[PDB]
Design a protein around this ligand. Structure first.
Ligand SMILES: CCCCCCCC(=O)OC[C@H](COP(=O)(O)O[C@@H]1[C@H](O)[C@H](O)[C@@H](OP(=O)(O)O)[C@H](OP(=O)(O)O)[C@H]1O)OC(=O)CCCCCCC
Length: 131
């Protein structure tokens, strides 16, 4: 039937491998997948999107621009949603940080054009610095 759950057997394997930080000592666990699923529904976003390569991309599109003015909860979300998203796409990052650079490049590639991503937005930022 249709696809269920967030991370399948294979995804779960790599998921447990990925670490929250590039130089930390706390690998990823289901605790983080559920922690976000409960926080997502709070933002009018169903947890069913976490199990969709498309949903994850959308969820990140709302937190991306809200990273600077986003509370600790927002930051944590963009992190988990990142490591997970990379799994539903193809990217096999080792840490959450890497997942940010991978997704940042994909979106940055569009910046060069700024033809479709420069109509709905009101005031874009011309000062992008690395974390
Ligand atoms: C307060 C006592 C009660 C807490 C129990 C709370 C209930 C619970 O167990 O929830 C799970 C967890 C929060 O609890 P949890 O203790 O694991 O919190 C995370 C932990 O302290 C990490 O070491 C922090 O990373 P860093 O060393 O600073 O990089 C991370 O980010 P920051 O907010 O500290 O920056 C913290 O969120 O949820 C998430 O947000 C994970 C999202 C993935 C984020 C991955 C990090 C990039």
């Amino acid at each position: 039937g249709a696809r269920a759950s967030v991370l399948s057997g294979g995804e779960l394997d790599k998921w447990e491998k990925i670490r929250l930080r590039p130089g930390g000592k706390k690998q990823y666990k289901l605790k983080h997948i559920v922690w976000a699923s409960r926080e997502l529904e709070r933002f009018a976003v169903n947890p069913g999107l976490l199990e969709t390569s498309e949903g994850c991309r959308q969820i990140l599109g709302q937190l991306q621009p809200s990273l600077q003015t986003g509370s600790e909860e927002l930051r944590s979300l963009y992190n988990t949603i990142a490591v997970l998203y990379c799994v539903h796409q193809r990217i096999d990052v080792k840490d959450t940080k890497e997942a940010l650079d991978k997704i940042e490049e994909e979106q940055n590639k569009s910046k060069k054009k700024a033809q479709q991503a420069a109509a709905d937005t009101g005031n874009n930022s011309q000062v992008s610095q690395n974390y």
